[PDB]
Amino acid sequence: KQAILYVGHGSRVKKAQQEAAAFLEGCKAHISVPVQEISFLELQEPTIETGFEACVKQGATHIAVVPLLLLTAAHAKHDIPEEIVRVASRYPSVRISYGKPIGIDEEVVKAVYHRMKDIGVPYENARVVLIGRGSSDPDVKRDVTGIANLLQEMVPVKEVIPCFLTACGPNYKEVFSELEKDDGITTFIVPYLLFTGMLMNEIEREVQKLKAHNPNVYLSSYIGFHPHVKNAFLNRVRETAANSEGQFDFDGGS
Ligand SMILES: [Fe+3]
C-alpha cells in the first residue's frame, strides 16, 4: 500500500555512487514500509522514473518521495519535482507526498559537534567556521546560518561563522584572510559536505595555507553520512510517510 521513493542527486564518481546507494539501502530496515526504492536525479541509476515505476508495479497506492539533500536549493524546489510530475502523470490514481531536505536539524548539529570532537583539541570557547558550498538561492545561506546558530546554542563555542565556497558571501577565503592573526583563540573548520572532491581538496590546501599564518586552526573531516545525519534523514523519511496534516502532499508545481 505505502511506498518510500528515496531520491539522491546522484554522482558520476563511482565511490560516491556506491556510498549513496549503500546508505539508502541501509536506511530501509529502519522504516516500516513494505515498498521502498532508491533513485537518483542524474548521472546514476536507478532513475527517478525507474524507481517510481517500480513502486507502482509493486502495488503502491501511496508514494513518499524523500530527497537526500543537506540543504534546500534548485534540486529540491525544481528539478526533482519536475521529474516527479513527468513520471507521475502516467499514474494519476497514486497519491504522492514529497519531503524536505535535512536543513536545520539538531541531529545534524550533533554531527557537526562530533566532527569537531574528532580533532581531539579542546573546543570550549573556540571559534567554528562552517563552510558550505553556497548557492545563489538565499535559502541555502539562510539554512547554513540557522545550523550555525543551533550549534552556537548547543555547544559552548565562542562563535560559529558560516561562509561559502561560491555563489554567495561571505567567501571562506575572506574569512580565512581575516583569520591570519593568531590571537590564541582556537578555530575549527567544518566542511558541510556529503562527499569529498575538488572543493574539499581546495579547502584542504587553503587550510594548509592558513595554518602557515595561524597554527591554532584545525580542519575536521567533512560530515559525510555520519550517524546523526542518518538520524536526521530518517526523521525526514518518517515525517514524509506519516504526512499527518497533508503538509507534504505533492501538489503540481514545486
Ligand atoms: Fe552523538
Q: What is the DSSP string of 89-117?
A: TT-TTSEEEE-----S-HHHHHHHHHHHH
Q: How far is the CA of 152 from the centre of ligand 1 (A)?
A: 16
- Residue 15 CA to residue 75 CA, distance in Å, equals 21
Residues 6+ apart with CB under 8 A from 90: none
112 and 220 in one domain? yes
108 and 35 in one domain? no
Tally of domains in the chain: 2
Pull the grid cell for residue 9: 542527486
62 and 94 in one domain? yes
- Residue 187 CA to residue 128 CA, distance in Å, equals 6
- Residue 88 CA to residue 235 CA, distance in Å, equals 25
Residue 34 backbone class (left: φ over 0; alpha: ψ -120 to 50; beta: rest): alpha
Q: How far is the CA of 168 from the centre of ligand 1 (A)?
A: 31
- Residue 190 CA to residue 97 CA, distance in Å, equals 33
Q: How far is the CA of 229 from the centre of ligand 1 (A)?
A: 10
Residue type, 248: F
Q: How far is the CA of 154 from the centre of ligand 1 (A)?
A: 12
157 and 49 in one domain? no
109 and 96 in one domain? no
Burial class of residue 1, CB neighbours in 10 A (0-12, 13-18, 19+): exposed
Q: How far is the CA of 230 from the centre of ligand 1 (A)?
A: 12
**Annotated binding residues for Fe cation, as ranges?**
9, 75
210 and 134 in one domain? yes
- Residue 225 CA to residue 232 CA, distance in Å, equals 11
Pull the grid cell for residue 151: 550549534
234 and 138 in one domain? no
Burial class of residue 253, CB neighbours in 10 A (0-12, 13-18, 19+): exposed
Backbone angles phi, psi at 25, to 5 degrees: -60, -45
Would the CA dihedral through 156, 201, 198, 13 be positive or negative? negative
90 and 44 in one domain? yes
Q: How far is the CA of 228 from the centre of ligand 1 (A)?
A: 7
Q: Which helix (H) or strand (E) element contains residue 2?
A: strand 2-8
Whether the Cβ atoms of residue 200 and residue 226 lie closer than 8 Å to each other: no
73 and 167 in one domain? no
Q: How far is the CA of 15 from the centre of ligand 1 (A)?
A: 26
80 and 55 in one domain? yes
117 and 204 in one domain? yes
- Residue 23 CA to residue 47 CA, distance in Å, equals 17
User: What range does the domain containing 216 cover?
Assistant: 104-224
Cα of first residue to Cα of last residue in the chain, in angstroms, is 25
Backbone angles phi, psi at 180, to 5 degrees: -75, -10
137 and 41 in one domain? no
Specify the 3-state DSSP secondary structure of 188.
strand
Residue type, 227: P
Q: How many residues does the chain have?
A: 254
Q: Where are the alpha helices (DSSP H) in the chain?
A: 14-27, 48-57, 74, 80-88, 106-117, 138-154, 172-178, 198-213, 227-242
Pull the grid cell for residue 102: 535535512
Residue from 54, 122, 137, 141 nearest 91 by CA: 54
- Residue 59 CA to residue 241 CA, distance in Å, equals 16
Q: How far is the CA of 109 from the centre of ligand 1 (A)?
A: 10
Residue 103 backbone class (left: φ over 0; alpha: ψ -120 to 50; beta: rest): left
Whether the Cβ atoms of residue 187 and residue 220 lie closer than 8 Å to each other: no
> Which residues is 249 bridged to in the sheet?
97
What method did the depositors use to determine the structure? X-ray
Residues 6+ apart with CB under 8 A from 196: 222
Q: How far is the CA of 215 from the centre of ligand 1 (A)?
A: 28
Q: Which residues of 183-212 are buried (b: 16+ CB within 10 A; e: fewer)?
A: eeebbbbbbbbbbbeebbeebeebbeebee
**Annotated binding residues, as ranges?**
9, 75
Residue from 154, 217, 158 nearest 189 by CA: 217
Q: At what angle do helices 227-242 and 106-117 cross, to 10 degrees?
A: 170
Q: How far is the CA of 227 from the centre of ligand 1 (A)?
A: 8
> Which residue is it, cell 522504516?
31
Give the count of alpha carbons within 13 A of 178, CB side only.
9
